[PDB]
């Protein structure tokens, strides 16, 4: 299947060269897998989610996404027009307030919730977790991401938007999860993209058009937008049975567009997430 006039990042991860506009993807489209979006929430009422999105946990007076960031990222995972795996299930975990912020204790509690809640869900093709969030280094936030990743959930985290080495950021620096840097439409490392050896992959992260609250859309930038590109791809690849939770990050990095990226500092992998779709 193909999506014409797709957002450039959808077209990117299905192409070996930049500049293209059509998103090529196997028709399975991540059907049968679940991605837990760990963010400000999701407006599951957005027609773009087609009923395949729902809130499962909030840590605030409401589960309503009043920030838009979680709706946007869940849109990149599995929305109809702006998503990598367009038939996947979308579970909202609201550990960020409507200002985008959130305590470490809350973010750890959300990861522990997802690791348990998945045992109450129907995800025969596996469980992915998209973590569009950042913070300073924390051994405890890292332990939560590691736990969740080891409980059987493919964990994708953002490298962070600091233009620095990602080793000083959690859960970005947890060695066992998938740390995602950001790229732009001309195959450059995004100006803000954290880097370093702990990075496993780069995804489209600059000017990413996806769903937004109120039933709208808006294009924003950040390694937080590169993460749902990878989480969705992991769900897509897992549904196709090409990988599993424990190995999706490594499989995505081995199947990646190698070396295509400009301005990659020495010692950071030069891999662009790629679904390698042939029809």
PDB file of C-alpha atoms in Angstrom:
ATOM      1  CA  UNK A   1       0.000   0.000   0.000  1.00  0.00           C
ATOM      2  CA  UNK A   2       1.028   3.609  -0.636  1.00  0.00           C
ATOM      3  CA  UNK A   3       0.019   6.952   0.864  1.00  0.00           C
ATOM      4  CA  UNK A   4       0.379   9.893  -1.510  1.00  0.00           C
ATOM      5  CA  UNK A   5       1.227  13.350  -0.158  1.00  0.00           C
ATOM      6  CA  UNK A   6       2.268  11.771   3.122  1.00  0.00           C
ATOM      7  CA  UNK A   7       4.140  13.834   5.707  1.00  0.00           C
ATOM      8  CA  UNK A   8       7.783  13.923   4.696  1.00  0.00           C
ATOM      9  CA  UNK A   9       8.816  11.688   7.596  1.00  0.00           C
ATOM     10  CA  UNK A  10       6.416   8.938   6.609  1.00  0.00           C
ATOM     11  CA  UNK A  11       7.792   9.196   3.071  1.00  0.00           C
ATOM     12  CA  UNK A  12      11.318   9.276   4.526  1.00  0.00           C
ATOM     13  CA  UNK A  13      11.233   6.010   6.505  1.00  0.00           C
ATOM     14  CA  UNK A  14       9.917   4.195   3.415  1.00  0.00           C
ATOM     15  CA  UNK A  15      12.613   5.603   1.102  1.00  0.00           C
ATOM     16  CA  UNK A  16      16.383   5.346   0.754  1.00  0.00           C
ATOM     17  CA  UNK A  17      16.717   8.943  -0.508  1.00  0.00           C
ATOM     18  CA  UNK A  18      15.159  12.154   0.870  1.00  0.00           C
ATOM     19  CA  UNK A  19      12.828  14.573  -0.903  1.00  0.00           C
ATOM     20  CA  UNK A  20      10.154  11.994  -1.713  1.00  0.00           C
ATOM     21  CA  UNK A  21       6.506  12.386  -0.747  1.00  0.00           C
ATOM     22  CA  UNK A  22       4.828   8.947  -0.951  1.00  0.00           C
ATOM     23  CA  UNK A  23       4.704   6.641   2.081  1.00  0.00           C
ATOM     24  CA  UNK A  24       5.054   2.980   1.088  1.00  0.00           C
ATOM     25  CA  UNK A  25       4.071   0.437   3.725  1.00  0.00           C
ATOM     26  CA  UNK A  26       2.822  -3.132   3.929  1.00  0.00           C
ATOM     27  CA  UNK A  27      -0.961  -3.214   4.168  1.00  0.00           C
ATOM     28  CA  UNK A  28      -0.818  -4.947   7.575  1.00  0.00           C
ATOM     29  CA  UNK A  29      -0.114  -1.443   8.912  1.00  0.00           C
ATOM     30  CA  UNK A  30       0.653  -2.566  12.457  1.00  0.00           C
ATOM     31  CA  UNK A  31      -2.703  -4.283  12.967  1.00  0.00           C
ATOM     32  CA  UNK A  32      -2.686  -6.450  16.082  1.00  0.00           C
ATOM     33  CA  UNK A  33       0.001  -4.543  18.003  1.00  0.00           C
ATOM     34  CA  UNK A  34      -0.343  -1.943  20.746  1.00  0.00           C
ATOM     35  CA  UNK A  35       1.718   1.203  21.300  1.00  0.00           C
ATOM     36  CA  UNK A  36       1.462   2.926  24.672  1.00  0.00           C
ATOM     37  CA  UNK A  37       1.927   6.652  24.127  1.00  0.00           C
ATOM     38  CA  UNK A  38       3.422   8.011  27.351  1.00  0.00           C
ATOM     39  CA  UNK A  39       2.836  11.743  27.077  1.00  0.00           C
ATOM     40  CA  UNK A  40       0.308  14.510  27.839  1.00  0.00           C
ATOM     41  CA  UNK A  41      -2.548  12.204  26.761  1.00  0.00           C
ATOM     42  CA  UNK A  42      -4.449  11.560  23.541  1.00  0.00           C
ATOM     43  CA  UNK A  43      -7.613  13.101  22.134  1.00  0.00           C
ATOM     44  CA  UNK A  44      -8.917   9.696  21.095  1.00  0.00           C
ATOM     45  CA  UNK A  45     -11.999  11.459  19.684  1.00  0.00           C
ATOM     46  CA  UNK A  46      -9.801  12.734  16.827  1.00  0.00           C
ATOM     47  CA  UNK A  47     -11.299  11.237  13.607  1.00  0.00           C
ATOM     48  CA  UNK A  48      -7.733  10.449  12.526  1.00  0.00           C
ATOM     49  CA  UNK A  49      -7.467   7.689  15.150  1.00  0.00           C
ATOM     50  CA  UNK A  50     -10.653   6.057  13.805  1.00  0.00           C
ATOM     51  CA  UNK A  51     -11.536   4.741  17.264  1.00  0.00           C
ATOM     52  CA  UNK A  52      -8.240   2.845  17.626  1.00  0.00           C
ATOM     53  CA  UNK A  53      -7.056   5.217  20.388  1.00  0.00           C
ATOM     54  CA  UNK A  54      -8.090   5.399  24.031  1.00  0.00           C
ATOM     55  CA  UNK A  55      -6.842   6.657  27.372  1.00  0.00           C
ATOM     56  CA  UNK A  56      -5.853   3.950  29.839  1.00  0.00           C
ATOM     57  CA  UNK A  57      -4.174   5.938  32.642  1.00  0.00           C
ATOM     58  CA  UNK A  58      -3.879   9.541  33.783  1.00  0.00           C
ATOM     59  CA  UNK A  59      -1.877  10.987  36.664  1.00  0.00           C
ATOM     60  CA  UNK A  60      -3.788  14.255  36.817  1.00  0.00           C
ATOM     61  CA  UNK A  61      -7.292  15.535  37.484  1.00  0.00           C
ATOM     62  CA  UNK A  62      -8.178  14.723  33.861  1.00  0.00           C
ATOM     63  CA  UNK A  63      -7.006  12.282  31.211  1.00  0.00           C
ATOM     64  CA  UNK A  64      -7.817  14.890  28.562  1.00  0.00           C
ATOM     65  CA  UNK A  65      -4.832  15.980  26.483  1.00  0.00           C
ATOM     66  CA  UNK A  66      -4.860  19.731  27.047  1.00  0.00           C
ATOM     67  CA  UNK A  67      -1.329  20.193  25.632  1.00  0.00           C
ATOM     68  CA  UNK A  68      -1.514  18.557  22.199  1.00  0.00           C
ATOM     69  CA  UNK A  69       1.903  16.905  22.452  1.00  0.00           C
ATOM     70  CA  UNK A  70       0.552  13.441  23.258  1.00  0.00           C
ATOM     71  CA  UNK A  71      -2.144  13.658  20.591  1.00  0.00           C
ATOM     72  CA  UNK A  72       0.530  14.686  18.070  1.00  0.00           C
ATOM     73  CA  UNK A  73       2.884  11.817  18.908  1.00  0.00           C
ATOM     74  CA  UNK A  74       0.137   9.202  18.995  1.00  0.00           C
ATOM     75  CA  UNK A  75      -0.788  10.637  15.602  1.00  0.00           C
ATOM     76  CA  UNK A  76       2.680   9.798  14.309  1.00  0.00           C
ATOM     77  CA  UNK A  77       2.458   6.241  15.670  1.00  0.00           C
ATOM     78  CA  UNK A  78      -0.928   5.170  14.338  1.00  0.00           C
ATOM     79  CA  UNK A  79      -3.146   7.891  12.938  1.00  0.00           C
ATOM     80  CA  UNK A  80      -4.742   7.326   9.548  1.00  0.00           C
ATOM     81  CA  UNK A  81      -2.983  10.164   7.704  1.00  0.00           C
ATOM     82  CA  UNK A  82       0.028  11.006   9.898  1.00  0.00           C
ATOM     83  CA  UNK A  83       0.974   7.593  11.309  1.00  0.00           C
ATOM     84  CA  UNK A  84       3.576   4.910  10.652  1.00  0.00           C
ATOM     85  CA  UNK A  85       1.377   1.917  11.617  1.00  0.00           C
ATOM     86  CA  UNK A  86      -2.135   3.008  10.658  1.00  0.00           C
ATOM     87  CA  UNK A  87      -4.060  -0.007  12.049  1.00  0.00           C
ATOM     88  CA  UNK A  88      -2.313  -0.248  15.432  1.00  0.00           C
ATOM     89  CA  UNK A  89      -3.883   0.244  18.851  1.00  0.00           C
ATOM     90  CA  UNK A  90      -3.074   3.471  20.691  1.00  0.00           C
ATOM     91  CA  UNK A  91      -3.132   3.520  24.499  1.00  0.00           C
ATOM     92  CA  UNK A  92      -2.765   6.898  26.188  1.00  0.00           C
ATOM     93  CA  UNK A  93      -0.688   7.128  29.359  1.00  0.00           C
ATOM     94  CA  UNK A  94      -0.854  10.707  30.677  1.00  0.00           C
ATOM     95  CA  UNK A  95       2.239  11.188  32.829  1.00  0.00           C
ATOM     96  CA  UNK A  96       2.788  14.741  31.559  1.00  0.00           C
ATOM     97  CA  UNK A  97       0.565  17.595  32.698  1.00  0.00           C
ATOM     98  CA  UNK A  98      -1.110  19.962  30.242  1.00  0.00           C
ATOM     99  CA  UNK A  99       2.041  22.122  30.394  1.00  0.00           C
ATOM    100  CA  UNK A 100       4.169  19.258  29.046  1.00  0.00           C
ATOM    101  CA  UNK A 101       6.022  18.834  32.355  1.00  0.00           C
ATOM    102  CA  UNK A 102       5.944  15.939  34.816  1.00  0.00           C
ATOM    103  CA  UNK A 103       7.725  14.525  37.859  1.00  0.00           C
ATOM    104  CA  UNK A 104      10.247  11.709  37.620  1.00  0.00           C
ATOM    105  CA  UNK A 105       8.184   9.726  40.135  1.00  0.00           C
ATOM    106  CA  UNK A 106       5.146  10.102  37.871  1.00  0.00           C
ATOM    107  CA  UNK A 107       7.042   9.047  34.735  1.00  0.00           C
ATOM    108  CA  UNK A 108       8.412   5.995  36.564  1.00  0.00           C
ATOM    109  CA  UNK A 109       4.895   5.134  37.763  1.00  0.00           C
ATOM    110  CA  UNK A 110       3.608   5.325  34.194  1.00  0.00           C
ATOM    111  CA  UNK A 111       6.269   2.943  32.892  1.00  0.00           C
ATOM    112  CA  UNK A 112       5.471   0.485  35.677  1.00  0.00           C
ATOM    113  CA  UNK A 113       1.778   0.845  34.822  1.00  0.00           C
ATOM    114  CA  UNK A 114       2.383   0.067  31.143  1.00  0.00           C
ATOM    115  CA  UNK A 115       4.500  -2.979  32.037  1.00  0.00           C
ATOM    116  CA  UNK A 116       1.551  -4.338  34.038  1.00  0.00           C
ATOM    117  CA  UNK A 117      -1.417  -2.979  32.051  1.00  0.00           C
ATOM    118  CA  UNK A 118      -0.262  -4.714  28.862  1.00  0.00           C
ATOM    119  CA  UNK A 119      -1.109  -8.039  30.544  1.00  0.00           C
ATOM    120  CA  UNK A 120      -4.750  -6.870  30.448  1.00  0.00           C
ATOM    121  CA  UNK A 121      -4.621  -5.985  26.731  1.00  0.00           C
ATOM    122  CA  UNK A 122      -4.982  -7.888  23.463  1.00  0.00           C
ATOM    123  CA  UNK A 123      -1.747  -7.285  21.536  1.00  0.00           C
ATOM    124  CA  UNK A 124      -0.871 -10.609  19.871  1.00  0.00           C
ATOM    125  CA  UNK A 125       1.707  -8.853  17.658  1.00  0.00           C
ATOM    126  CA  UNK A 126       3.452  -7.301  20.678  1.00  0.00           C
ATOM    127  CA  UNK A 127       3.591  -4.110  22.723  1.00  0.00           C
ATOM    128  CA  UNK A 128       5.548  -0.935  21.941  1.00  0.00           C
ATOM    129  CA  UNK A 129       5.942   2.098  24.210  1.00  0.00           C
ATOM    130  CA  UNK A 130       6.596   5.595  22.844  1.00  0.00           C
ATOM    131  CA  UNK A 131       8.164   8.006  25.357  1.00  0.00           C
ATOM    132  CA  UNK A 132       8.074  11.544  23.938  1.00  0.00           C
ATOM    133  CA  UNK A 133       9.682  13.103  26.999  1.00  0.00           C
ATOM    134  CA  UNK A 134      13.042  14.177  28.364  1.00  0.00           C
ATOM    135  CA  UNK A 135      14.840  14.994  31.577  1.00  0.00           C
ATOM    136  CA  UNK A 136      18.213  15.086  33.245  1.00  0.00           C
ATOM    137  CA  UNK A 137      20.059  11.898  34.058  1.00  0.00           C
ATOM    138  CA  UNK A 138      18.367   9.679  36.630  1.00  0.00           C
ATOM    139  CA  UNK A 139      19.330   6.142  37.609  1.00  0.00           C
ATOM    140  CA  UNK A 140      15.691   5.618  38.639  1.00  0.00           C
ATOM    141  CA  UNK A 141      14.057   6.865  35.432  1.00  0.00           C
ATOM    142  CA  UNK A 142      16.535   4.661  33.563  1.00  0.00           C
ATOM    143  CA  UNK A 143      15.603   1.665  35.730  1.00  0.00           C
ATOM    144  CA  UNK A 144      11.918   2.165  34.885  1.00  0.00           C
ATOM    145  CA  UNK A 145      12.574   2.266  31.141  1.00  0.00           C
ATOM    146  CA  UNK A 146      14.825  -0.783  31.527  1.00  0.00           C
ATOM    147  CA  UNK A 147      12.162  -2.649  33.509  1.00  0.00           C
ATOM    148  CA  UNK A 148       9.428  -1.857  30.985  1.00  0.00           C
ATOM    149  CA  UNK A 149      11.751  -2.821  28.131  1.00  0.00           C
ATOM    150  CA  UNK A 150      12.513  -6.104  29.898  1.00  0.00           C
ATOM    151  CA  UNK A 151       8.863  -6.809  30.751  1.00  0.00           C
ATOM    152  CA  UNK A 152       8.336  -7.387  27.016  1.00  0.00           C
ATOM    153  CA  UNK A 153       7.623  -3.894  25.668  1.00  0.00           C
ATOM    154  CA  UNK A 154       9.674  -2.298  22.913  1.00  0.00           C
ATOM    155  CA  UNK A 155      10.607   1.031  24.497  1.00  0.00           C
ATOM    156  CA  UNK A 156      11.470   4.009  22.308  1.00  0.00           C
ATOM    157  CA  UNK A 157      12.723   7.159  24.027  1.00  0.00           C
ATOM    158  CA  UNK A 158      13.758  10.547  22.679  1.00  0.00           C
ATOM    159  CA  UNK A 159      17.420  11.503  22.742  1.00  0.00           C
ATOM    160  CA  UNK A 160      16.332  14.956  23.868  1.00  0.00           C
ATOM    161  CA  UNK A 161      16.480  18.378  22.226  1.00  0.00           C
ATOM    162  CA  UNK A 162      19.663  19.783  23.813  1.00  0.00           C
ATOM    163  CA  UNK A 163      22.208  19.544  20.931  1.00  0.00           C
ATOM    164  CA  UNK A 164      24.434  17.741  23.439  1.00  0.00           C
ATOM    165  CA  UNK A 165      25.545  14.212  24.267  1.00  0.00           C
ATOM    166  CA  UNK A 166      22.494  12.163  25.228  1.00  0.00           C
ATOM    167  CA  UNK A 167      24.403  10.380  28.018  1.00  0.00           C
ATOM    168  CA  UNK A 168      23.285  13.140  30.429  1.00  0.00           C
ATOM    169  CA  UNK A 169      19.559  12.525  29.902  1.00  0.00           C
ATOM    170  CA  UNK A 170      17.078   9.943  31.133  1.00  0.00           C
ATOM    171  CA  UNK A 171      15.449   7.754  29.985  1.00  0.00           C
ATOM    172  CA  UNK A 172      17.527   8.642  26.911  1.00  0.00           C
ATOM    173  CA  UNK A 173      20.710   7.164  28.385  1.00  0.00           C
ATOM    174  CA  UNK A 174      19.267   3.780  29.420  1.00  0.00           C
ATOM    175  CA  UNK A 175      21.367   1.360  27.315  1.00  0.00           C
ATOM    176  CA  UNK A 176      18.608  -1.237  26.843  1.00  0.00           C
ATOM    177  CA  UNK A 177      15.865   0.917  25.264  1.00  0.00           C
ATOM    178  CA  UNK A 178      15.791   2.532  21.806  1.00  0.00           C
ATOM    179  CA  UNK A 179      17.189   6.068  22.028  1.00  0.00           C
ATOM    180  CA  UNK A 180      15.967   8.028  19.003  1.00  0.00           C
ATOM    181  CA  UNK A 181      17.650  11.100  17.587  1.00  0.00           C
ATOM    182  CA  UNK A 182      15.958  13.455  15.158  1.00  0.00           C
ATOM    183  CA  UNK A 183      16.564  14.292  11.505  1.00  0.00           C
ATOM    184  CA  UNK A 184      15.171  16.813   9.028  1.00  0.00           C
ATOM    185  CA  UNK A 185      13.834  16.485   5.498  1.00  0.00           C
ATOM    186  CA  UNK A 186      17.267  17.089   3.912  1.00  0.00           C
ATOM    187  CA  UNK A 187      18.883  14.149   5.770  1.00  0.00           C
ATOM    188  CA  UNK A 188      20.513  16.336   8.430  1.00  0.00           C
ATOM    189  CA  UNK A 189      20.706  15.720  12.130  1.00  0.00           C
ATOM    190  CA  UNK A 190      18.150  18.152  13.506  1.00  0.00           C
ATOM    191  CA  UNK A 191      19.774  21.273  14.944  1.00  0.00           C
ATOM    192  CA  UNK A 192      18.417  20.365  18.402  1.00  0.00           C
ATOM    193  CA  UNK A 193      18.982  16.598  18.237  1.00  0.00           C
ATOM    194  CA  UNK A 194      20.981  15.095  21.059  1.00  0.00           C
ATOM    195  CA  UNK A 195      23.589  12.575  19.955  1.00  0.00           C
ATOM    196  CA  UNK A 196      26.290  10.300  21.348  1.00  0.00           C
ATOM    197  CA  UNK A 197      27.003   6.592  21.471  1.00  0.00           C
ATOM    198  CA  UNK A 198      23.824   5.741  23.407  1.00  0.00           C
ATOM    199  CA  UNK A 199      21.726   6.767  20.410  1.00  0.00           C
ATOM    200  CA  UNK A 200      20.483   3.751  18.472  1.00  0.00           C
ATOM    201  CA  UNK A 201      18.630   5.342  15.553  1.00  0.00           C
ATOM    202  CA  UNK A 202      17.505   8.607  13.990  1.00  0.00           C
ATOM    203  CA  UNK A 203      13.948   9.341  12.943  1.00  0.00           C
ATOM    204  CA  UNK A 204      12.263  12.259  11.182  1.00  0.00           C
ATOM    205  CA  UNK A 205      11.982  14.932  13.836  1.00  0.00           C
ATOM    206  CA  UNK A 206      11.929  18.397  12.225  1.00  0.00           C
ATOM    207  CA  UNK A 207       8.615  19.903  11.057  1.00  0.00           C
ATOM    208  CA  UNK A 208       6.577  16.749  11.670  1.00  0.00           C
ATOM    209  CA  UNK A 209       2.936  17.181  10.647  1.00  0.00           C
ATOM    210  CA  UNK A 210       0.589  15.104  12.806  1.00  0.00           C
ATOM    211  CA  UNK A 211      -2.713  15.222  14.665  1.00  0.00           C
ATOM    212  CA  UNK A 212      -3.372  17.912  17.251  1.00  0.00           C
ATOM    213  CA  UNK A 213      -6.037  18.482  19.898  1.00  0.00           C
ATOM    214  CA  UNK A 214      -9.356  20.106  19.054  1.00  0.00           C
ATOM    215  CA  UNK A 215      -9.582  17.807  16.039  1.00  0.00           C
ATOM    216  CA  UNK A 216      -6.810  19.727  14.262  1.00  0.00           C
ATOM    217  CA  UNK A 217      -3.263  19.237  12.942  1.00  0.00           C
ATOM    218  CA  UNK A 218       0.012  21.067  13.435  1.00  0.00           C
ATOM    219  CA  UNK A 219       3.651  20.563  12.457  1.00  0.00           C
ATOM    220  CA  UNK A 220       6.170  20.703  15.316  1.00  0.00           C
ATOM    221  CA  UNK A 221       9.765  19.597  15.833  1.00  0.00           C
ATOM    222  CA  UNK A 222      11.758  17.632  18.381  1.00  0.00           C
ATOM    223  CA  UNK A 223      13.353  14.291  19.092  1.00  0.00           C
ATOM    224  CA  UNK A 224       9.960  13.796  20.761  1.00  0.00           C
ATOM    225  CA  UNK A 225       8.591  13.642  17.192  1.00  0.00           C
ATOM    226  CA  UNK A 226      11.316  11.262  16.001  1.00  0.00           C
ATOM    227  CA  UNK A 227      10.359   8.778  18.740  1.00  0.00           C
ATOM    228  CA  UNK A 228       6.800   7.932  17.524  1.00  0.00           C
ATOM    229  CA  UNK A 229       8.251   7.433  14.037  1.00  0.00           C
ATOM    230  CA  UNK A 230      10.373   4.615  15.476  1.00  0.00           C
ATOM    231  CA  UNK A 231       7.782   3.249  17.928  1.00  0.00           C
ATOM    232  CA  UNK A 232       5.263   2.988  15.101  1.00  0.00           C
ATOM    233  CA  UNK A 233       7.823   1.351  12.817  1.00  0.00           C
ATOM    234  CA  UNK A 234       8.605  -1.130  15.602  1.00  0.00           C
ATOM    235  CA  UNK A 235       4.884  -1.904  15.835  1.00  0.00           C
ATOM    236  CA  UNK A 236       4.721  -2.172  12.036  1.00  0.00           C
ATOM    237  CA  UNK A 237       7.760  -4.462  11.856  1.00  0.00           C
ATOM    238  CA  UNK A 238       6.532  -6.518  14.819  1.00  0.00           C
ATOM    239  CA  UNK A 239       3.102  -7.083  13.246  1.00  0.00           C
ATOM    240  CA  UNK A 240       4.824  -8.261  10.061  1.00  0.00           C
ATOM    241  CA  UNK A 241       6.692 -10.682  12.327  1.00  0.00           C
ATOM    242  CA  UNK A 242      10.106  -9.406  11.240  1.00  0.00           C
ATOM    243  CA  UNK A 243      11.154  -8.754  14.849  1.00  0.00           C
ATOM    244  CA  UNK A 244       9.967  -8.865  18.464  1.00  0.00           C
ATOM    245  CA  UNK A 245       9.873  -6.434  21.381  1.00  0.00           C
ATOM    246  CA  UNK A 246      13.302  -7.391  22.752  1.00  0.00           C
ATOM    247  CA  UNK A 247      15.061  -7.015  19.376  1.00  0.00           C
ATOM    248  CA  UNK A 248      13.048  -4.422  17.415  1.00  0.00           C
ATOM    249  CA  UNK A 249      15.540  -1.651  18.220  1.00  0.00           C
ATOM    250  CA  UNK A 250      18.477  -3.747  17.013  1.00  0.00           C
ATOM    251  CA  UNK A 251      16.524  -4.942  13.968  1.00  0.00           C
ATOM    252  CA  UNK A 252      15.578  -1.361  13.069  1.00  0.00           C
ATOM    253  CA  UNK A 253      19.202  -0.255  13.434  1.00  0.00           C
ATOM    254  CA  UNK A 254      20.477  -3.126  11.268  1.00  0.00           C
ATOM    255  CA  UNK A 255      17.813  -2.497   8.598  1.00  0.00           C
ATOM    256  CA  UNK A 256      18.312   1.275   8.728  1.00  0.00           C
ATOM    257  CA  UNK A 257      19.331   3.687   5.988  1.00  0.00           C
ATOM    258  CA  UNK A 258      23.030   3.631   6.855  1.00  0.00           C
ATOM    259  CA  UNK A 259      25.210   6.724   6.562  1.00  0.00           C
ATOM    260  CA  UNK A 260      22.628   8.943   4.842  1.00  0.00           C
ATOM    261  CA  UNK A 261      22.702  11.656   7.524  1.00  0.00           C
ATOM    262  CA  UNK A 262      24.664  14.915   7.519  1.00  0.00           C
ATOM    263  CA  UNK A 263      26.249  16.437  10.642  1.00  0.00           C
ATOM    264  CA  UNK A 264      26.490  13.259  12.735  1.00  0.00           C
ATOM    265  CA  UNK A 265      29.221  13.779  15.382  1.00  0.00           C
ATOM    266  CA  UNK A 266      31.975  11.200  15.630  1.00  0.00           C
ATOM    267  CA  UNK A 267      30.838   8.127  17.548  1.00  0.00           C
ATOM    268  CA  UNK A 268      27.088   8.570  17.035  1.00  0.00           C
ATOM    269  CA  UNK A 269      25.452   6.009  14.763  1.00  0.00           C
ATOM    270  CA  UNK A 270      24.469   7.305  11.335  1.00  0.00           C
ATOM    271  CA  UNK A 271      21.264   5.307  10.919  1.00  0.00           C
ATOM    272  CA  UNK A 272      17.904   6.527   9.613  1.00  0.00           C
ATOM    273  CA  UNK A 273      14.844   4.443  10.470  1.00  0.00           C
ATOM    274  CA  UNK A 274      13.678   2.568   7.384  1.00  0.00           C
ATOM    275  CA  UNK A 275      10.975  -0.057   6.824  1.00  0.00           C
ATOM    276  CA  UNK A 276      12.618  -1.551   3.687  1.00  0.00           C
ATOM    277  CA  UNK A 277       9.244  -2.055   2.033  1.00  0.00           C
ATOM    278  CA  UNK A 278       9.145  -3.901  -1.274  1.00  0.00           C
ATOM    279  CA  UNK A 279       5.728  -4.540  -2.804  1.00  0.00           C
TER     280      UNK A 279
END
